[PDB]
Amino acid sequence: VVVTGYTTQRKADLTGAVSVVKVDEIQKQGENNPVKALQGRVPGMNITADGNPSGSATVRIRGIGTLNNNDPLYIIDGVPTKAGMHELNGNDIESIQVLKDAASASIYGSRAANGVIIITTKQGKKGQIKINFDASVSASMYQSKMNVLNTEQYGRAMWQAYVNDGENPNGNALGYAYNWGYNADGNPVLYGMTLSKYLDSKNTMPVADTDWFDEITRTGVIQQYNLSVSNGSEKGSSFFSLGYYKNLGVIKDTDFDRFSARMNSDYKLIDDILTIGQHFTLNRTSEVQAPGGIIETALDIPSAIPVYASDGSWGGPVGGWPDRRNPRAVLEYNKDNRYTYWRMFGDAYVNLTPFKGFNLRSTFGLDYANKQARYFTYPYQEGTQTNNGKSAVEAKQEHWTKWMWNAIATYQLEVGKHRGDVMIGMELNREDDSHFSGYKEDFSILTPDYMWPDAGSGTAQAYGAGEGYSLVSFFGKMNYSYADRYLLSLTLRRDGSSRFGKNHRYATFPSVSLGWRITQENFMKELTWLDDLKLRASWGQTGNQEISNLARYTIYAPNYGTTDSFGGQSYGTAYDITGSNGGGVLPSGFKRNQIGNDNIKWETTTQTNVGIDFSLFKQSLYGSLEYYYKKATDILTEMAGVGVLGEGGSRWINSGAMKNQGFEFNLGYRNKTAFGLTYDLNGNISTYRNEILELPETVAANGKFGGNGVKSVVGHTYGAQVGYIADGIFKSQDEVDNHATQEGAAVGRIRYRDIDHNGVIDERDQNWIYDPTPSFSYGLNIYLEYKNFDLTMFWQGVQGVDIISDVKKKSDFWSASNVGFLNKGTRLLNAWSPTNPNSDIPALTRSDTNNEQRVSTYFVENGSFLKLRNIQLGYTVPAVISKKMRMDRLRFYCSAQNLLTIKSKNFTGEDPENPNFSYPIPVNITFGLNIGF
Amino acid sequence: VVVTGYTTQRKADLTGAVSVVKVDEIQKQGENNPVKALQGRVPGMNITADGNPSGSATVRIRGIGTLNNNDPLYIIDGVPTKAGMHELNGNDIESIQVLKDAASASIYGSRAANGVIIITTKQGKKGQIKINFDASVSASMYQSKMNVLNTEQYGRAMWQAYVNDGENPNGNALGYAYNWGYNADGNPVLYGMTLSKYLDSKNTMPVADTDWFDEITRTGVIQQYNLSVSNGSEKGSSFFSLGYYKNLGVIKDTDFDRFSARMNSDYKLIDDILTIGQHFTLNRTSEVQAPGGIIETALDIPSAIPVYASDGSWGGPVGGWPDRRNPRAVLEYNKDNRYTYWRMFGDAYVNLTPFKGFNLRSTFGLDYANKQARYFTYPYQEGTQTNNGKSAVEAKQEHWTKWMWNAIATYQLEVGKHRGDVMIGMELNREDDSHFSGYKEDFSILTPDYMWPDAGSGTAQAYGAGEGYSLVSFFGKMNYSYADRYLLSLTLRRDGSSRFGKNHRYATFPSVSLGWRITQENFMKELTWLDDLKLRASWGQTGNQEISNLARYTIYAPNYGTTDSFGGQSYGTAYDITGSNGGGVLPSGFKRNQIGNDNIKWETTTQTNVGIDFSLFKQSLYGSLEYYYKKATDILTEMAGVGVLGEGGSRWINSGAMKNQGFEFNLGYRNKTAFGLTYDLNGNISTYRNEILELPETVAANGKFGGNGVKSVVGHTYGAQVGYIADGIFKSQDEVDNHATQEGAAVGRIRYRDIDHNGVIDERDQNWIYDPTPSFSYGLNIYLEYKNFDLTMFWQGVQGVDIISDVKKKSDFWSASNVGFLNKGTRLLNAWSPTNPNSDIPALTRSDTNNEQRVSTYFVENGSFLKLRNIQLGYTVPAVISKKMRMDRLRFYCSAQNLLTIKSKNFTGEDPENPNFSYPIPVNITFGLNIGF
């Protein structure tokens, strides 16, 4: 029996694509977020994340659905919230339904276009008093370090670039000395290379060989605790959890810690005609955030810079070396930007049955959450890197508030061989967000406790805003079986929000879903090895409303001009009249911000579905097979006002359409063998294919969504880039005339193929080179049970992925970024030379002669992989030794996450998931236990 | 069985002055605050309050104890908090112990010098599933309106003042016309009086007769709701409350509303060797606050001013009339200064008994509370009253956080005829307060939703601070009986806070308490009508530590000078060097704020006690009789630095002593009579007497505490004022030489008696005229029980009180305040005249010729009273009609608060509790019900 919306149906009576998740593995993955702890157990649901200690996750359901925001809608004990789950207690979990469909998720709202994830929490069982106590102590180790070139290879690369120019390499701005000459074969050979002693003339900074990715990185411990007490009688139940989870990241001076609590209960009074219950949660998270671009800064700075000066201050690029801040200083100054986040839930449902089989309900949600921060800035001095002696402190504060109310009323009848369930009810909502801030300047002492905004001297500012939302709706549902053969369900939800235009308030969303069994038909009784086979099909129509709050309002704004605008644009409304030329007493006025239409509308999607169930071989080989085809029809794109409309012409209109189709196929084989062993192998294989149907205007031309301003996106998939084709190097001398009219043609300088074959090195040779929607995404869970032992493994992967690497631009070209003399990655030290003609890496030039920074097939890798997510070995302590200590179950398990990975030949990198500069993925090793009374 | 600290003892085994309160009347008083709902049920505990809708209360226990802050310490389910209880749910109350003693409250802390109020909450009983549902709908009516004089009496008073001058009354600045003449007996008689049509020459404001106390006052409704569900089995218990309480004050545009919740539970696992439980609360209050001086402003403004102008704007004193703002405008602009206050509690106690009779415990408190506000200011224009066109908005935010941890370990043995209970344990605490703010200026549109700090143009500021606290202690307790005759208990608590000086961290607090029975001695068995008589005596030593947080630190502060200081004092640290004379780049420095000693110390009190119990007449006539004598010895007084110490000489030292002594006597007679009736009459009579033992320095001279700078306070009581003696009027002509050398001597001008009898109208004739510590404070509760009916009454009063009235200065003198032509109270219209020589009210002069604003016996009234606090009549619905509806108990009661009052002859006022300008006390009338399932 599972929960789908507000009701509970049977397990074998579903009609939509309700994918129920086994929650026996969520505590075995060992993470903060449960959604990150899925990461492949379900099909058609791409979850991508980092090794951020908060464990936040980017979730897509059934592939990409809409151009703008498409986060799914979580539901935690009736009350919904679209934001969180890395701060919620991820261990009071009873079942996680995932409603991937639209004809089964149409009941829950208009805002269920991206699919809803129904979560429920634990409860008290009848006649049990059990109490558990979990723990874990882990360790995080770094594995995916990109290799960079140190001081000798840096000097060799600089010498190679200057002799490929032909300029004397000894006339460089850096402190290098080169002893070199000419070989008899014409190629220059570097004989001797010698550094200086200091970095400048004034002898402030010595030279060294600093390992930056070994300087900002530590091993980080990870702790965890838990406790859970239950209860339960024939008239009441209770539950009461606790928690703690402390994570210290692999990058230095970032962390996360979460405290938690939970109280659940219910009380049934008069023969089950009156039932009051509640659900409550209370968290506190406290995360120090990593700064922006700290991996890229750790790649950029040359290794000759020391981490300290002659005195205790930080070292820096004192002259000639490019302007990159010391990353150890960036992590040492972003140490006490700690925020603090409280959060509460609520529920109070009241049940009432007047005669029999006919219930009523009236809940009341609540969702409060505030967030206090205090962000410091400091004065620094590293050679030429100086913030000019500036001190400030910003003291933010944000607030959120939601509350719902709904009153369903269900009916239940069983006569003959027919059962049915009709329910009706309304719903309410209200969101009241806020924030404000402060600012001060020019402090005297520099510590995180002196720098409160009263101990300052300088100028001050203040900020703040406020938002809102409302909703009111009515719904309905039906069920039918008529023989325990032919299932049928119809829903309908009329709903009207507070962001829809003035022309139409209420929106209607119908749904039809039907399914019928096979093995209960009497003409199939000759097939005895089969056990159950269920057909299903459905057709729904949902559509979200995550449009901006000011889409229908024609905003006017004061804009006196106190805020800063560089360039003198400064769209102000002051205008000193009387010719005073002085004094801050100027009059004010209103400029127009944007212009709204009154005919705004939700983003409706019409999604069909066809599914097939099976079960064989005395309840084994279970699994499904589904097919789906969705089509959103009204996507919002804000368009700039043409010409004579002047300022404030950005009108939000809704036109655009996408369509998605694919397959899902899960399977599971559980069977005990004669060896004295029991195995279980669940697994799933998905398939995904996207298309943009039509895009309205020149927004399709400039390429906000797809091709980079040179090709239309309509017809192809979403996010597909369009660029050149690079097929090799100018290896021979006769490539300068074997090729056709190349602009930059040298002994390096990768060739671009002709498409028009007319000497075309114009911008008319680009084609679609990169589409990020892979086929053949799959996963596999493997479970073993020997005597007194248990082993759990996992595998997850995807085949046929294209990625756009930007560490390849940093590691294959000497001059591709803007600033010069940056550190690189040590793949380019084996570049093309007259001595070594056996490498595909181009030559090392000092200037971008041939335009090599264009988008091209040289920057497309094979992103297919297969990596083990976790493996966990346990050891259950046997019966009489545990029962001598008056306890039920004991366990001493061990596990490790992300232990290995295998990739293709076609990838010169370090991590096939995130090739770019994000937070890395570290290896965990866990040594925990599980005391169960 | 009651809770005293961390343990539970028997009801008849107490030794200190533990006054247990019957909580069956807290829900019958019908208020928000429970402490305000005591107000006289206990002796030796003065509670004073107003009709503020929040219902906050000023509480003193055993009279005044210390010169600075002396609020008591509340304890709600183990975790303490010194602030609140008008925001807590005042209906989940199980028992309220009040530990008035020091040898019984010495266990709970050093900070129990002012007595502790132990509160506990409800729980689940064994084998019950009950559920209650309370309600109320009330009405608040105004009764205590001070009488003011309207336009004709105002003109008559002005004419009488001008003819007592002798100046022509028609040459006044206001629009009045007087037709008058001289009678043959010399006295001037006013024949005709005529007003104008408008108030100014430009005809902007008409004239009228506006009733100000009828303009800012409305009848205000009061709502209330509740719900409570319990549970309980042999292994677990639960409880779950709700709540709502909405109050709309009698003064217009002030209100209060509180939402609430509560969850309590506990679970005992293995034969009572493991027990986990919790207590949680969650509130939300939202109060719009009344402004400062709105009763005084409603008294001050003359009644000729209209509430509106010729157009829709507010009227005002356009010329000649004194500068007082329109009070209806003050209430209309302070309409949306609403704040919002969330609050949580917490507890998680873990019990464990290793073998038998020997428990352990480990709790963990939590107390979070934030408070968000947004205070507006507006531009106004009423004649000459104008805020110069200024708009601003301040967006405050405050935060609090406490958490405790303690681990007691008790033992229990019973051998022979001896029992004992020894327990030891430690304790921890930490307070982390905060706040910050913002500010903006010069807004365009004037509404409470446009005025967020981003839609402004003007200057901005920011504020903020942060505080702290810590504590760690160790304690102990003992018990003994040896025969069930001779009781004895010894405690000791070693404690050291984080505000004590560097010379000594930890403080020790001993206690001895003993008591012994009478009726268990065999030589008293001949007295058979007596039932129980218990002696008790105790000697303790406690002392609080509510000293300032910076009492030992020698504060230095930057003070650049950005803040404002009028007069040019401006103790800044800028000092432009290089002679620039311009540019805001000036250097900065540190000035000294104050200077701290390292030998600071807590404010210790040594309090003894002697008590007598009795019980008679087959368990009736119960009551006690106590006597007490406390003596605090180290009171903190900050003293200014003498002379050459210069700036920052305010050192906190501790020297000073007070002593208090008095009686308490409670009684109760419960007896069913033969009439078919049952009565119950509890009652109590207290007695109080204070003295200041010694005060160190010139702080006793200038009169911060007692006499107004002319007499020392040492020897007398606290707060006693010293002034002249006024004994009558100069009724006859020969009083100018019957009296002795009066400065201002006229036909009015009250005489002051000579003390030195040397023609002394010097400052050497003042004596102690006013001491605010009354004798004979008492109360009485009366309960009636007829068949199928119940009546509850109450009476509370105090005899022999002196007060200092300042409405008497406004209602007896024409010119006593600073500004002229103010409205007054209509007692002075029957003042002394040659026509009426039969009044004690002095003559109406225009100028203060004789200094009548001195402190004198003319401004001392008899503040004794006796008023009915509440009376409540109920009607229980009988058995079979209630039991037909499947419910237990039904009730339809009615009640009214503050219905009447009786006072002495010696008081010409309206309310003997608060004669000054505070929030008034309105009459409630309640028509509620009580459904009990």
| CA gap A880, A904 in Å, rounded | 51
Measured between CA atoms, how close is B249 to chain A, in angstroms? 27
Q: Which residues of B301-320 are buried (b: 16+ CB within 10 A; e: fewer)?
A: bbbbbbbebeeeebbbbbee
Q: Do B454 and A465 touch (CB under 8 A)?
A: yes
The pair phi, psi for residue B118, each rounded to 5°, is -85, 120
| Vertex B258: Cα angle to B256 and B259 (nearest 5) | 155
Contact, A344 vs A367, CB < 8 A? Answer: yes
CB atoms within 10 A of CB B343: 20
- Give kind and range of the element (H or E) at residue A330: helix A327-333
CB atoms within 10 A of CB B503: 11
Structure tokens at B86: 């008008």
3-state secondary structure B588-657: CCCEECCCCCCCCCCEEEEEEEEEEEEEECCCEEEEEEEEEEEEECECEEEECCCHHHCCCCCEEEECEE
Contact, B499 vs B597, CB < 8 A? Answer: no
Identify from B347, B436, B556 which residue to disrupt to test chain A contact, counting A C-beta atoms within 10 A and taking the largest count: B436
Contact, B597 vs B651, CB < 8 A? Answer: yes
Q: Is A482 on the interface with B (CB under 8 A)?
A: no
End-to-end CA distance of chain B: 27
Residues of chain A in contact with residue B460, where contact means CB-CB under 8 angstroms, are 460-462
Extract the runs of DSSP E, i.e. beta strands, from B291-366.
340-344, 350-351, 358-360, 363-364
Residue with tokens 């009204």: A634
| Vertex A544: Cα angle to A541 and A546 (nearest 5) | 170
Closest CA to B689 of B777, B813, B557, B607: B777
Q: Which residues of A677-687 are buried (b: 16+ CB within 10 A; e: fewer)?
A: eeeeebbbebb
Structure tokens at B732: 């006859």
CB atoms within 10 A of CB A147: 11
HSE-up of residue A647 (Cα within 13 Å, Cβ side): 11
Q: Determination technique for this PDB entry?
A: cryo-EM
Structure tokens at A636: 């919002």
Structure tokens at A333: 């100054």
Closest CA to B107 of B420, B634, B657, B512: B512
Q: Do A462 and B558 touch (CB under 8 A)?
A: no
Measured between CA atoms, how close is A701 to chain B, in angstroms? 36
Closest CA to A606 of A629, A575, A635, A624: A629
Residue with tokens 């990715």: A213
Residues of chain A in contact with residue B270, where contact means CB-CB under 8 angstroms, are 886, 933
Residue type present at position A498: S
**In angstroms, how far is CA B633 from the centroid of its own chain?**
25
Closest CA to B667 of B794, B525, B781: B781
End-to-end CA distance of chain A: 27
Cβ-Cβ pairs closer than 8 A, A with B, add up to 164
Q: Is A131 on the interface with B (CB under 8 A)?
A: yes
| CA gap A162, A4 in Å, rounded | 69
Residues of chain B in contact with residue A348, where contact means CB-CB under 8 angstroms, are 242
Residue B341: strand pairing partners: B285, B371
| CA gap A883, B270 in Å, rounded | 13
| CA gap B709, B704 in Å, rounded | 8
| CA gap A71, A90 in Å, rounded | 19
Task: Give the nearest partner residue to A265 out of B240, B274, B558, using CB atoms.
Answer: B240
Strand, helix or coil for residue A299 = helix
| CA gap A877, A893 in Å, rounded | 11
Strand, helix or coil for residue B455 = coil
Contact, B274 vs B303, CB < 8 A? Answer: no
- Give kind and range of the element (H or E) at residue A613: strand A603-616
Name the residue of chain A whose CA is nearest to B271's CA: A886
In terms of phi and psi (left: phi > 0; alpha: psi -120 to 50; beta: otherwise), the region of B682 is beta
Structure tokens at A350: 């009241």
Identify from A129, A226, A259, A436 which residue to disrupt to test chain B contact, counting B C-beta atoms within 10 A and taking the largest count: A436
β-pairing verdict for B636-639 and B591-592:
unpaired
DSSP label at residue B398: E
Helices of type H across B181-264 = none
Residues of chain B in contact with residue A236, where contact means CB-CB under 8 angstroms, are 129, 231, 233, 238
Q: Is B554 on the interface with A (CB under 8 A)?
A: no
Exposed, middle or buried: residue B261 (CB in 10 Å: 0-12, 13-18, 19+)? buried
Exposed, middle or buried: residue A302 (CB in 10 Å: 0-12, 13-18, 19+)? buried
| CA gap B823, B150 in Å, rounded | 9
- Give kind and range of the element (H or E) at residue B206: none
DSSP string spanning A22-71?
PTTSHHHH--S-TTTTTSSSSSSEEEEE-S-TT--EEEEESS---SS---
Structure tokens at B649: 């000489």
Residues of chain B in contact with residue A560, where contact means CB-CB under 8 angstroms, are 456-457
Contact, B102 vs B542, CB < 8 A? Answer: yes
Q: Do A436 and B439 touch (CB under 8 A)?
A: no
- Give kind and range of the element (H or E) at residue A657: strand A657-673
Structure tokens at B839: 């009044």
- Give kind and range of the element (H or E) at residue B396: none
| CA gap A818, A804 in Å, rounded | 19
Torsion sign (Cα): B849, B855, B861, B863: positive
Structure tokens at A293: 């671009």
Q: Which residues of B815-828 are buried (b: 16+ CB within 10 A; e: fewer)?
A: bbeeeebbbbbbbb
DSSP string spanning B833-871?
-SS----SS----SS--S---S-BGGG-EE--EEE--EE
| CA gap A88, A259 in Å, rounded | 9
Compute CA distances B529 → B132, B533, B534, B614, B619, whole Å. 42, 12, 15, 12, 10
| CA gap B305, B300 in Å, rounded | 12
Residue with tokens 């290794």: A303
Structure tokens at B482: 């040896």
Helices of type H across A371-487 = none
Structure tokens at B204: 């902007």
The pair phi, psi for residue A627, each rounded to 5°, is -145, 145
3-state helix, strand, coil in chain B (%, to 5): 5, 40, 55
A340: which residues sit within 8 A by CB, 6+ positions away? Answer: A284, A285, A286, A371, A372, A373
| CA gap B748, B746 in Å, rounded | 5
| Vertex B330: Cα angle to B154 and B84 (nearest 5) | 120
| CA gap B36, B624 in Å, rounded | 24
| CA gap B435, B396 in Å, rounded | 8
Torsion sign (Cα): A581, A587, A591, A593: positive
Contact, B608 vs B593, CB < 8 A? Answer: no
Torsion sign (Cα): A375, A381, A385, A390: positive
A324: which residues sit within 8 A by CB, 6+ positions away? Answer: A297, A300, A301, A317, A822
Q: Which residues of B125-147 are buried (b: 16+ CB within 10 A; e: fewer)?
A: eeeebbbbbbebebebebebebe
Exposed, middle or buried: residue B905 (CB in 10 Å: 0-12, 13-18, 19+)? exposed
β-pairing verdict for B57-61 and B556-557:
unpaired
Compute CA distances A305 → A198, A316, B183, B575, whole Å. 10, 6, 108, 41
| CA gap A609, A367 in Å, rounded | 34
Residue type present at position A114: N
| Whole-number CA gyration radius for chain A | 32
CB atoms within 10 A of CB A547: 20
Q: Is A455 on the interface with B (CB under 8 A)?
A: yes
Measured between CA atoms, how close is B398 to chain A, in angstroms? 11
Q: Which residues of B37-58 are buried (b: 16+ CB within 10 A; e: fewer)?
A: bbbbbbbbbbbebbbbbbbbbe
A852: which residues sit within 8 A by CB, 6+ positions away? Answer: A749, A750, A813, A816, A842
| CA gap A666, B769 in Å, rounded | 94
| CA gap A192, A203 in Å, rounded | 24
| CA gap A205, B197 in Å, rounded | 89
Contact, A854 vs A766, CB < 8 A? Answer: no
Residue with tokens 């200590």: A885
Residue with tokens 């369900």: A489
HSE-up of residue A54 (Cα within 13 Å, Cβ side): 20
β-pairing verdict for A486-497 and A469-477:
antiparallel
Measured between CA atoms, how close is A594 to chain B, in angstroms? 16
Q: Which residues of A493-518 are buried (b: 16+ CB within 10 A; e: fewer)?
A: bbbbbebbeeeeeebebebbbbbbbb
Identify from B230, B267, B400 which residue to disrupt to test chain A contact, counting A C-beta atoms within 10 A and taking the largest count: B267
A569: which residues sit within 8 A by CB, 6+ positions away? Answer: none
The resolution, in angstroms to one decimal, equals 3.9
β-pairing verdict for B244-248 and A651-654:
unpaired
Contact, A907 vs A862, CB < 8 A? Answer: yes
Strand, helix or coil for residue B164 = helix
| CA gap B636, B699 in Å, rounded | 11
| CA gap B128, A267 in Å, rounded | 11
Contacts 24+ apart (CB under 8 A), B81-86: B81/B367, B81/B402, B82/B111, B84/B343, B85/B33, B85/B34, B85/B35, B85/B57, B86/B32, B86/B33, B86/B36, B86/B54, B86/B55, B86/B56, B86/B57
CB atoms within 10 A of CB A916: 12
Compute CA distances A469 → A425, A428, A556, whole Å. 21, 11, 20
Contact, B822 vs B719, CB < 8 A? Answer: no
Compute CA distances B33 → B46, B239, B671, B779, B797, whole Å. 15, 21, 31, 19, 20
Compute CA distances A319 → A198, A329, B703, whole Å. 12, 19, 70
Structure tokens at B526: 């001949």
Extract the runs of DSSP E, i.e. beta strands, from A347-390.
350-351, 358-360, 363-364, 367-372, 375-377, 381-382, 385-386
Q: Do A452 and B464 touch (CB under 8 A)?
A: yes
Q: Is A236 on the interface with B (CB under 8 A)?
A: yes
3-state secondary structure A530-546: EEECEEEEEEEEEEECC
**In angstroms, how far is CA B841 from the centroid of its own chain?**
34
Strand, helix or coil for residue A162 = helix
Residue with tokens 């009636």: B784
